[PDB]
Ligand binder design. Structure first.
Ligand SMILES: *[C@@H]1O[C@H](CO)[C@@H](O[C@@H]2O[C@H](CO)[C@@H](O[C@@H]3O[C@H](CO)[C@@H](O)[C@H](O)[C@@H]3O)[C@H](O)[C@H]2NC(C)=O)[C@H](O)[C@H]1NC(C)=O
Ligand SMILES: *[C@@H]1O[C@H](CO)[C@@H](O[C@@H]2O[C@H](CO)[C@@H](O[C@@H]3O[C@H](CO)[C@@H](O)[C@H](O)[C@@H]3O)[C@H](O)[C@H]2NC(C)=O)[C@H](O)[C@H]1NC(C)=O
Ligand SMILES: *[C@@H]1O[C@H](CO)[C@@H](O)[C@H](O)[C@H]1NC(C)=O
Ligand SMILES: *[C@@H]1O[C@H](CO)[C@@H](O)[C@H](O)[C@H]1NC(C)=O
Ligand SMILES: *[C@@H]1O[C@H](CO)[C@@H](O)[C@H](O)[C@H]1NC(C)=O
Ligand SMILES: *[C@@H]1O[C@H](CO)[C@@H](O)[C@H](O)[C@H]1NC(C)=O
Ligand SMILES: *[C@@H]1O[C@H](CO)[C@@H](O)[C@H](O)[C@H]1NC(C)=O
Ligand SMILES: *[C@@H]1O[C@H](CO)[C@@H](O)[C@H](O)[C@H]1NC(C)=O
Lengths: 480, 203, 203, 480
């Protein structure tokens, strides 16, 4: 009777979990290889022109490589499938809340968003690739329950796309239960207990699928040591301690995160109404994405070229290190922030022992990356806003940690790694303002429970101080 | 039989004590101008052979809380592995690893050319730096590891000394003097969105 | 000035190397019949004074990756703190800690009484065990710590040797021979709920 | 208008959190001092009679000390306030589900249960003291909203006693969010968002109150390193790893926990129907509690006296070590399991490095403690069943770990500490069968998230395999 219907529902949720894991590992593998190729070309070209003059050809090579990749990404996005632009999380959030924006029910949207996010992280923009993983999981789940049956019903479709969005969050951040609570914050029109188990089944099977395929891409099939596209794990040193000295410090850091999130949202609001008003033809959108990729390449190169902090290579801090003007055997330090992927600069900011970052270098990188991510977000590319927000927050959180380590006599409790974590949670809650799902995600991905209560306080403080100025980003883009 | 020792085991312990005192001597004779894996490899084979000689006996290792012989042998192994002296020996041991004797010969050659009183002996230094980078890449395909793994310590400190002479003391790096094409290209590309946004505003 | 050394700093390093070679010798001369804090306390004060002599200089400690002088000094401190040799010295150092010379005198007294060829020299052993428990309780009120903290290692191994002679070798512990009152009381108390549950079942 | 009503509700929840924390630290301080006095008397009396004969006077001293303390506890419980017996968790669970058993609305029940659980853990029975902490928090919360106003309403009273039960769980296990999800599994007649924040406010303020008063009882006021009455923390060594080799092993261990939980529930069911049928007068109940305290004392002493495993004292494994028949300088090992408090034998089973436990000694202790806890539970004393279940499960889980360490060649993945954890969760889910609240509690108290999924699997397996035989304990005692 009804038992075969529930087996059909559970096997559909198993397929959308497996397919979302395969799409996530496809994105990670292709981005890793293509960014490896592009950064090896540029590092091989800077070192050729380091002596004997030149070095403006390296800037043109960087700018044109960024421009070519984002030109491909925006001709794909802004001409063919225009709703594929952005992270798509506002569209899925309002899909779960009830209103159906068109052209989400097509497999073409999945192909354009996956290809766009491959060609945008490679393209050198300030883009995280786990923003649109939620939308990719959503359209996979919607496309499973269609044609080209009693699953085309809108009650059955909304629950399946809820499971797809949860599988997207779990494949993104390594958070199964975080994916469950993300799917339940929107469209919570019921507490169907079998629906939450379906959601958790798809969520956990998506994380385990991404483990299995990424580990067979690595050496050991038996390892499973990569739960997500970002994994800033192992917060269980003596730097795990949060203490009564630090709870009002975390509340104040949540206030600063909420203020800077309001600044981010307001500047992007004025920018995106300028883009609605004037830059609305598809050809102008393609040209604007090409220039902003060229500008983030050249402002990265101006900041690299005009920096004097040089530190020697510790074993894994620099992926593609270049010595620009440093001495032999010492490598550049600002070039470690624009050549690392943003999923690794965050981990480095969480884990480097104190005194490993210049305040001037990190401050300049923070300011330029803040304005770059604010400019790059409202574009016609397939692009998240998570890891830009998380890197901005980790960077100024580490600056806060260095300041607290200087004001006190280099105390044990003022470790800059922990304050980088709390800053990243503060800015991600200031820009986005999701309350509980980030608490569970930032508990899950760090594998620490004692960061549950202070991260939860920081997210509430950032949300409240942010909402007294301007709405959140994912809610603002349903109001244009 | 308990508080005293078997006389051959006493002699075995005395032999290990003599050999290990010589090794600690060798490690600190050659402390700052680092020749740790260059002058103390045969003493290290001596000490690890006496430690293997003890455990073929039973009373020497685990019959007290501290196990002073075992923690001393573990300290010499930790000092060996942190130094990575296996690159200063061949894979069959007790030799001097023909990759590195060329490096030490060129290091001595470079310093004797530095003894000639400015920027004259440069291609010897460039050959040295090319050789050092070649051995670094050799230390990741024969012995697979992460990028920037640590080489043998006397090689690495020889290259340390050469680079600290060449940069911090002699002050010779022939700077770029190509700033103004970079600043021209940079102000052009930064002025490009000003042109684009104003022209789209005025259309 | 870089690859060679200042001659007084070379002499300072040579002095530390001689003193530390003597200390490693002393640590392994006295390895199994443990006299580590009994025969190597003045050499340890010698080594820590030469290490303090170096850091009053700058080139000896932190001018290479390994810092072989610093890790050697840290190894001697770890061996010192694990042994807890501070109980074998007075609080002002370089003495022999009058609590413990009485213990070593009684330990020698007990072994010389064990050399008389069964169970005759027992009250010396009971005095030794009472003294050892007294020093254990002394090592928790003067130096506050957990129950069962570790005493000074030659004291603790002397007591180790005495107890291993007294139990594992001599086999003398005068067993209880009071099993049958225990088994009588135990079968009485275990039969009490049988009486209670049956009497409440039959009422 | 309504704002002053919500401030009244939140200040009442703050008071019940603070009062439940004070009651929890009162229980912990008095139990620690009285059990210290009693075990120092017995250890000072065994060592006197170890030589020169005797040693039956030590058995009488142990049996009469147990009998005297439980005689006081049962004359208090079985004569004055008869519903104060047991853990009271079935009564509170059915209070939240709607039916109101009488004599829960009195402060006398709070005094009798607190005094009974002091006089029962001290009394040497197989009793955990964090069972009735939930009922003590419940009656504190009910007594706050009464006389000797609009809070005597049954809608207002049920929500306050929900917050009191959550504060009881948080003060018990150190689990704030675990206390929240315990209070929401029962009486979930609504998802009032402000009610869950009230519950979490009382829960977190109860845990922090217990930290503050227990740390000022200890040395440092600034420490706060005791979140609950049991804290088996720090699972973040290399023994934290759960691996694909072990997921069917955890499912099998959940099966064994469910089977043994069914055995526990069935034997206690027959025993408690015998007690309903015949041993029902109050004087017979007092005599029966006196004999079962004397019997657990004497079977502890027979197992101590007839044991030959002797191991030397590692720094904190033995609280009050006695050498009975071992050599000098080596202390008895079976006496470390009956003289430690059950809140410390569990931590030792989770944390001792492998090869530190005899299989014969631990097997004998497991078998005797299983039948002792099964006998002692259905009594007229104020008594939990948590830490008996948790110690039984940790003990046979450690036996499973030793077996897996013997069958494989002492593998890295077959660490007995991790399997002791999974066994404790298995037996606590086999005897009690609460699904999700133990998953959150055993994540919270161990401070590890990677033990979320395997503990959740183990609890589901134990619950299912248990429910095919006999109902859970806390549901069986509403059906007599
Ligand atoms: C009293 O004397 C006995 C000698 O019979 C000492 O027992 C031995 O103590 C050492 C130190 O813990 C044990 O060594 C251990 O070996 C294992 C590997 O087998 C290793 O994993 C440990 O980390 C440690 O190195 C040894 O097993 C033990 N037993 C024997 C038979 O040798 C005892 O420590 C002495 N007591 C004191 C207080 O000195
Ligand atoms: C090349 O030579 C330079 C000498 O100028 C070496 O730099 C020094 O290296 C040591 C080793 O890391 C540093 O010591 C550190 O000291 C801090 C406390 O100040 C301590 O926390 C660290 O754990 C470590 O012991 C030292 O700071 C550093 N710099 C100076 C000015 O002495 C460099 O390591 C050499 N490179 C190689 C590859 O050998
Ligand atoms: C001890 O070592 C020496 C040299 O390593 C060797 O000649 C000798 O045979 C060894 N002793 C034994 C008993 O094997
Ligand atoms: C020292 O030599 C090797 C290198 O670390 C090590 O594998 C061996 O076990 C050590 N021998 C000892 C501690 O006796
Ligand atoms: C260079 O090597 C020769 C022999 O190999 C040696 O005599 C000479 O002292 C070395 N030069 C320096 C500066 O040590
Ligand atoms: C070095 O140590 C010795 C003895 O500890 C002392 O006499 C001497 O003055 C020290 N050297 C200096 C330069 O202080
Ligand atoms: C060695 O001596 C003491 C004892 O551990 C320690 O505090 C000191 O810092 C050490 N000295 C060194 C490492 O130079
Ligand atoms: C006992 O002490 C005396 C002097 O203190 C010494 O001559 C003698 O050798 C010691 N006995 C033993 C067995 O070492």
């Amino acid at each position: 009777a009804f038992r075969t219907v529930e087996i059909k529902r559970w096997v559909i949720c198993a397929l959308i979990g497996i397919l979302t894991g395969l799409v996530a590992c496809f994105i990670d593998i292709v981005v890793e290889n293509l960014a490896g190729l592009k950064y090896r070309v540029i590092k091989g070209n800077i070192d050729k022109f380091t002596e004997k003059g030149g070095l403006s050809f390296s800037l043109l090579l960087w700018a044109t490589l960024n421009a070519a990749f984002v030109l491909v990404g925006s001709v794909i996005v802004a001409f063919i499938e225009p709703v594929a632009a952005g992270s798509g999380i506002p569209q899925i959030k309002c899909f779960l809340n009830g209103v159906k924006i068109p052209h989400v029910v097509r497999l073409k949207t999945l192909v354009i968003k996956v290809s766009g996010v491959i060609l945008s992280v490679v393209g050198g923009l300030a883009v995280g690739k786990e923003g649109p993983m939620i939308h990719s999981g959503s359209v996979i789940a919607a496309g499973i329950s269609q044609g080209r049956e009693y699953f085309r019903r809108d009650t059955e479709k909304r629950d399946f796309v809820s499971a797809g969005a949860a599988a997207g969050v779990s494949a993104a951040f390594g958070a199964p239960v975080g994916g469950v609570l993300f799917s339940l914050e929107e469209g919570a029109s019921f507490w169907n207990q079998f629906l939450t188990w379906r959601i958790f089944f798809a969520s956990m099977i998506s994380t385990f699928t991404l483990n299995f395929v990424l580990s067979i891409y690595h050496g050991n099939m038996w390892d499973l040591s990569s739960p997500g596209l970002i994994n800033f794990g192992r917060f269980d040193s003596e730097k795990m301690a949060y203490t009564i000295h630090e709870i009002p410090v975390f509340i104040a850091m949540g206030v600063v995160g909420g203020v800077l999130g309001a600044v981010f949202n307001a500047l992007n609001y004025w920018l995106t109404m300028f883009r609605i008003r004037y830059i609305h033809r598809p050809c102008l959108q393609v040209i604007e994405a090409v220039l902003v990729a060229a500008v983030t390449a050249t402002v990265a190169f101006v900041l690299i070229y005009s920096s004097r902090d040089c530190q020697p290579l510790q074993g894994g801090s620099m992926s593609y290190p270049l010595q620009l003007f440093c001495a032999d055997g010492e490598y550049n330090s600002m070039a470690a922030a624009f050549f690392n992927t943003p999923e690794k600069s965050v981990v480095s900011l969480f884990h480097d022992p104190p005194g490993s970052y210049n305040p001037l270098t990190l401050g300049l990188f923070t300011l330029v990356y803040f304005f770059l991510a604010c400019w790059t977000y409202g574009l016609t590319v397939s692009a998240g806003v998570f890891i830009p927000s998380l890197l901005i927050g980790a960077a100024w959180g580490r600056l806060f940690g260095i300041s607290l380590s200087y004001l006190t006599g280099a105390a044990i409790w003022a470790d800059p790694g922990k304050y980088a974590l709390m800053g990243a949670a503060a800015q991600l809650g200031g820009i986005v303002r999701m309350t509980l799902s980030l608490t569970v995600i930032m508990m899950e991905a760090t594998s620490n429970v004692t960061y549950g209560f202070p991260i939860m306080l920081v997210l509430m403080t950032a949300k409240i101080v942010g909402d007294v100025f301007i709405e959140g980003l994912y809610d603002m883009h349903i109001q244009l | 039989d308990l508080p005293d020792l078997d006389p051959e085991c006493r002699e075995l312990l005395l032999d290990f004590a003599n050999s290990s005192a010589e090794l600690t001597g060798c490690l600190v004779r050659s402390a700052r101008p680092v020749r740790l894996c260059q002058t103390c490899y045969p003493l290290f084979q001596q000490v690890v052979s006496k430690m293997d000689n003890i455990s073929r006996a039973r009373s020497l290792l685990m019959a007290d809380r501290m196990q002073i012989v075992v923690i001393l042998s573990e300290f010499f192994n930790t000092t060996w592995q942190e130094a990575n002296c296996a690159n200063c020996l061949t894979n069959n041991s007790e030799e001097l690893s023909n990759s590195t004797v060329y490096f030490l010969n060129l290091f001595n050659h470079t310093l004797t050319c530095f003894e000639h009183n400015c920027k004259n002996c440069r291609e010897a230094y460039k050959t040295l730096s090319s050789l050092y980078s070649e051995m670094q890449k050799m230390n990741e395909l024969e012995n697979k590891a992460e990028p920037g793994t640590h080489l043998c310590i006397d090689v690495e400190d020889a290259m340390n000394i050469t680079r600290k002479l060449w940069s911090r003391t002699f002050n010779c790096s022939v700077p770029c003097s190509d700033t103004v094409p970079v600043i021209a290209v940079s102000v052009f590309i930064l002025f490009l969105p000003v042109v684009f946004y104003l022209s789209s505003f005025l259309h």
